[PDB]
Amino acid sequence: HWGYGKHNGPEHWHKDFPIAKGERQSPVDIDTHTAKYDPSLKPLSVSYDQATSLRILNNGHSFQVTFDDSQDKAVLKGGPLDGTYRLLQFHFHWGSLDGQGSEHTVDKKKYAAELHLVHWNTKYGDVGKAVQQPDGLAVLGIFLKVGSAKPGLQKVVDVLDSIKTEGKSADFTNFDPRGLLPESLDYWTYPGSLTTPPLAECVTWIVLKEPISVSSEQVLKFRKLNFNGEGEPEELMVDNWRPAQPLKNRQIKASFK
Ligand SMILES: COc1cc2c[n+](Cc3cc(OC)c(OC)c(OC)c3)ccc2cc1OS(N)(=O)=O
Numbered sequence: 001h002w003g004y005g006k007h008n009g010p011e012h013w014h015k016d017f018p019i020a021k022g023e024r025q026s027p028v029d030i031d032t033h034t035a036k037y038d039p040s041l042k043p044l045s046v047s048y049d050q051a052t053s054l055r056i057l058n059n060g061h062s063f064q065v066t067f068d069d070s071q072d073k074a075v076l077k078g079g080p081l082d083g084t085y086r087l088l089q090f091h092f093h094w095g096s097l098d099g100q101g102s103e104h105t106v107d108k109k110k111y112a113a114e115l116h117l118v119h120w121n122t123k124y125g126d127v128g129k130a131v132q133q134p135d136g137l138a139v140l141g142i143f144l145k146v147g148s149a150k151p152g153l154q155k156v157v158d159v160l161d162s163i164k165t166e167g168k169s170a171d172f173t174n175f176d177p178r179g180l181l182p183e184s185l186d187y188w189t190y191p192g193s194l195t196t197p198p199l200a201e202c203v204t205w206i207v208l209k210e211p212i213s214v215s216s217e218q219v220l221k222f223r224k225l226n227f228n229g230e231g232e233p234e235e236l237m238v239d240n241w242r243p244a245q246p247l248k249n250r251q252i253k254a255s256f257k
């Protein structure tokens with residue numbers, strides 16, 4: 001089954017998921033000199049004041065915080081989107097070294113990690129239906145660089161000890177995702193896919209220009225999670241990122257000049 005190792009990593013995924021070689025795969029390198037300023041793009045509207053986090057889970061390839069998406073509590077709208085998208089979860093991708101870990105790159109520059117906030121289009125009623133649609137999901141991507149600590153991330157960092165191995169989960173209530181956002185909401189956008197299997201091409205990507213800073217002590221605690229389940233040979237959860245895919249017939253648009 002798929003993963004990020006030598007024998008089951010991204011270069012192998014196409015054998016189980018032929019769409020891995022598709023026309024709108026993610027992530028991509030963002031070439032800042034060929035991205036196109038689009039003045040018709042609206043500002044992002046991020047309404048997270050009513051968010052209700054539920055649980056944090058090690059799913060064997062990442063860790064994720066899940067939210068209550070049974071109502072329009074935490075929604076994303078505006079930008080390139082039509083309609084309302086509800087926040088479902090966030091998770092991270094990170095590296096074994098501070099020079100790698102992000103999935104998207106900017107002028108070939110890799111960041112230490114990348115935060116994905118996954119939202120689904122309420123027009124489709126449930127996330128399972130949305131993944132079958134070209135505009136089903138919107139993923140907000142935020143880069144992490146190593147520097148000063150990010151205080152709003154520390155509650156996540158402090159609980160990772162309790163979900164060290166695959167399948168462990170814990171109650172994780174009253175977490176405010178607004179503490180993870182950069183100051184500016186300037187963004188690039190392009191049509192893309194999930195970066196994990198089944199790699200469905202259902203995502204409007206929104207990648208923020210401004211990275212957030214995290215401390216070396218914060219990101220080191222990511223690197224001590226395990227891919228394996230408890231009682232299996234230990235395997236540190238690092239480099240759980242898919243490399244950049246061909247842009248093919250797509251245009252990256254920028255909201256900022
Ligand atoms: C942890 O990484 C991810 C978890 C995801 C989890 N989901 C949830 C999901 C995905 C589904 O199908 C793919 C579902 O229908 C089978 C479904 O029914 C409830 C729920 C969707 C997209 C995801 C994308 C993810 O990665 S990414 N990098 O493309 O944002």
Ligand SMILES: [Zn+2]
Binds near residue numbers: 091
């Ligand atoms: Zn992701």
